[PDB]
């Protein structure tokens, strides 16, 4: 494995919109492997491949031992309901937390490693990283959608 270097707001890289993966490939597969030990050493719970310098749809998030690792590739979201409001911060904005409101609950579709389709549902904690997650595959960035940062 190895631990990649998160690159920190400001760079283009993170506000470019990702590519779809085509290839679901070895590279793809120690991508993400390196990306979600990288994520865990920094603390994270969410990591997105812009964020590693890779401008394609593959994201991580880990909150929970439970559910655990959940690796996302060309996910969309396919429902949201409720609203939840609450604070957010982000591996590529070091230190920065601001106040972000994001659906409560999600249904999610997105492939694993082979390329498989899944269907995902998620609230809470665990839906917002996902969604503040696939955003940076769109080139999006958390600080588009605070509402306010705290003292
Ligand atoms: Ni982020």
Known sequence: MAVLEIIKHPNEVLETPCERVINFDKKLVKLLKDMH???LIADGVGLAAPQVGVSLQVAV???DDDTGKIE???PSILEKRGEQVGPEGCLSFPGLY???ERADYIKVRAQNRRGKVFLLEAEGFLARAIQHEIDHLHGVL???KVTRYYE
Do not use: H, R
């Open 72 to 74: 996302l590739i060309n």
């Open 37 to 39: 030990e990288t994520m």
């Open 98 to 100: 601001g106040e972000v």
């Open 61 to 63: 998030v880990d909150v």
């Open 142 to 144: 958390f600080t588009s």
